[PDB]
Amino acid sequence: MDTQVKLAVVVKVMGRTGSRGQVTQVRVKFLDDQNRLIMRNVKGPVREGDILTLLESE
Amino acid sequence: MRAKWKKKRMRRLKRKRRKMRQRSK
Amino acid sequence: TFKRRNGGRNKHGRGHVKYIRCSNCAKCCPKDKAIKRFQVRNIVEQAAIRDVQEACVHDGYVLPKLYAKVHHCVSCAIHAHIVRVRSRENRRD
Amino acid sequence: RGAPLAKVTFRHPFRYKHQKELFVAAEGMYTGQFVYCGRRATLSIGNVLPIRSVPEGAVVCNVEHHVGDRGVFARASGDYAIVISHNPDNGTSRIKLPSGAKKIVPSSCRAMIGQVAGGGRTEKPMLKAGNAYHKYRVKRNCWPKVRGVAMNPVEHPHGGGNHQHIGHASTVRRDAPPGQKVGLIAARRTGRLRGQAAATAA
Amino acid sequence: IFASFNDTFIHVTDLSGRETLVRITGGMKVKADRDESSPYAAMLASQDVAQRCKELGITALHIKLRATGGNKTKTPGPGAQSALRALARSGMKIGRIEDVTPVPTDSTRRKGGRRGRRL
């Protein structure tokens, strides 16, 4: 499953190892057409309000 | 009172080494 | 050794309480030396809250939280939870 | 059986009155105490009455394996059955036996309140061969046990051999015919560990 | 009218999870789980894998058979819990009420982690 909407805002890092700088996935919601919860992958820390393109997303 | 593992080891060996002369081997 | 007014550790006219076993390892611990921590926490999440209530009957419900005291063997608490070490004065807290 | 039966004397006349003789002894019974035998009898030790009127969880001695056979379950000393279940069940009273088996038996069947007397009899040791002899003499048993190894090969399958030994496997089949069927007959296991009482489930 | 009550049960250990599509009496209509696919072990317990399991359940219950109201009930806590619960919305499943009732600790206190489980 998963649609494909423009952008995506990270709701909050669901955990991982971490401490400072967060290598592993994060749970994201689509910025527009909200309330679709999936796990998309990032390297590095990330904040809510951040804008990143999730082009094909899935 | 009772001390430490020195007495623990030697307790086991106390009657064993008396009986290891009847046995020998 | 003795740096403590607390004697050995939580022993005040008792010596031995009545044992709980750790959630983590199941080692016996008397209750006052156990380490209990309130984990009153939602089932959902932050994000999850929204989704459930949209697709559910009744306005929000209440959401029926999970309540658990978590029992540690001392060692277990050090690795993640609340021990961490301290500075000398604040240890009397 | 080397254990007592209380002599209870019923004496009342008529002519066809039938009376007299030995009901099985229970603990705590005394001479000159009255014994009541029947349906609506009071609940006191030594009285015999149908099992239905006895409440659940109640220790009894003697039960009937169909009415009028007089005493079948628990009769050997210091043993007793405990009536495990009833409910309002017309058909069935369930009794946990001293074997540990849970038995369906009619609710009409009589049982006597209490445990049977003379308990502890077998527990403490004889400490003579001669004490053993006297008990077995009075009952139907021939006293000394000669081992199968000690017997000749003609007399016994385990006999014979230069040295002392049982020649073959002791365990023989249950289906095996008379003469063949020797040793530990149809043993579920052997060698010394971790069994239990008869354990039915319901 | 839609009387609409039908429980789904998720049987969880920390190590792995499986979903059993039960009902109000509790007899199962169907069950399914991952491990026919590639990830095995604590990668089932994993939240990404948990979503895959959840949807497989739901799809039978609604559209095909056609019960609509449903309780989610779970047994003790995994990492998977948030993912399963969130995805019930995207299953197009309507929660009649949600109650989790994993089984409480009551002093089933024995060394082999008999107590160690529970909640």
Add this chain to the structure above:
Amino acid sequence: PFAKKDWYDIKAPSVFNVRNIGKTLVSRTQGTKIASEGLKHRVFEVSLADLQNDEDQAYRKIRLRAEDVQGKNVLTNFWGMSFTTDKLRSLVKKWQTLIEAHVDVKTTDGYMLRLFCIGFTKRRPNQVKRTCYAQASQIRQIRRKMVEIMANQASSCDLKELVSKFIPEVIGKEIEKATSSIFPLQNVFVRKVKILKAPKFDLGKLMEVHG
């Protein structure tokens, strides 16, 4: 199996809320081990939240067992009152007393019930203490009273009357008022109830509680 399974819509009795309970599928009513006659006495739990509408009973599930079926519409009478775990887990917070009690009672015809009752000391104006404890033998005096009071209010005309008190939990609250003169009591609920020593079905009588 799915293209053979029945549908039972399960009906509550009369004295109760909303008559609808749920939807099941079983497996076709095939001769010898029919799906109807077979089961029944399984358990149906629906929260009082989904029956009274309100969330002032957001917990409290009720165990109903089926005794009779009339053509794929399965009747039920009270065979218990249950509780969530989450309700006991909330309520029971640290630093305060428990007051515990158990009851066994039968009703007119001998349907067996087990009533419970738990209670905390209630906070008083001007408290400094983070604790506020009663004094144990004092607690015990309360406990003895609870059993008597519940029994007197109860054992009247079967399930029927008592059940309709249980749902808005009237019985519990009446206790608190009288008792408070000597010692508080907080909450006080029926909590759980199982039948485990039923009389007889008495199928005639059951249909009075059905319509």
Add this chain to the structure above:
Amino acid sequence: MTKRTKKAGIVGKYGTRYGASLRKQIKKMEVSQHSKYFCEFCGKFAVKRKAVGIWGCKDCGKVKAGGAYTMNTASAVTVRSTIRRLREQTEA
């Protein structure tokens, strides 16, 4: 006392024979055979072992059922108590 350390009964009977474990059980149950017991009926410390499982009080003449070696038994106490409790609650 005389040439007696502990006591015997049956230790003296044996000679060298039988053994230390074996005498423990039987010493306890043979002292019980000898043992005077108080009657429920008269209250005197009369009662003596008539036979196996049979006890008789000499003075009042009352004959009583009991254990083989001993007047009563631990098992006997348990059995009577449960029966009396069940009788008491049901009769109510």
Add this chain to the structure above:
RNA sequence: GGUGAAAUUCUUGGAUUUAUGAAAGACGAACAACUGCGAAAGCAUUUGCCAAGGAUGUUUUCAUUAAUCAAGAACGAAAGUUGGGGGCUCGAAGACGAUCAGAUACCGUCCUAGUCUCAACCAUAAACGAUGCCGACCAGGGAUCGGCGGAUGUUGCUUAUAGGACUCCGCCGGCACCUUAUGAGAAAUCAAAGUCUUUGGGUUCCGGGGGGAGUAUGGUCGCAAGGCUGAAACUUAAAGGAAUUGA
């Protein structure tokens, strides 16, 4: 099942799971606390009975009965055990899987004795407050446990009240904390480890370098395990403590 990762092991002999009864045996979560009681070991469901013990109160009574102890006596966790009940759970040894050159273990899985109870043994624990018992004194403060006293306080509503829970202040006796410590101490710390160099309050026990050795030997005891009592040859200059500074 299981875990970090796997496997032994269990799976149409449709497990796992699910519900309902019943049986069996165990245990009293959360509540349950720098809080209680009991000589101590130790002791948490309800209720009844039975005797018991401390604290407190007392213009009741006796009038020095007291204090503390070799000997001697009672009780004394666990394990092991003697015999029954009893064996649910778990679980030395063993037997299995990984890990491991070895792994006999941690870890996983099977599981016997045993765990439980009862009558018996036993006599030991970091059986600890590592701190003898008893008495008087030297220093401020707030909690909480128990009882008592004083309030035309609160709640209670008990007919009204008294009580009781709450708030209080005073107070006997507590478990202890807190902060300073006059003072002790080697320091860490400590209202006792103070009141021993200001050297001697009463009583008792023990140590008197480290190892050997808590063994050897003898006596004593124990059912057994083994305990209790307890050396010396010979070795050797430090063993040990607390704090401090490095790594």
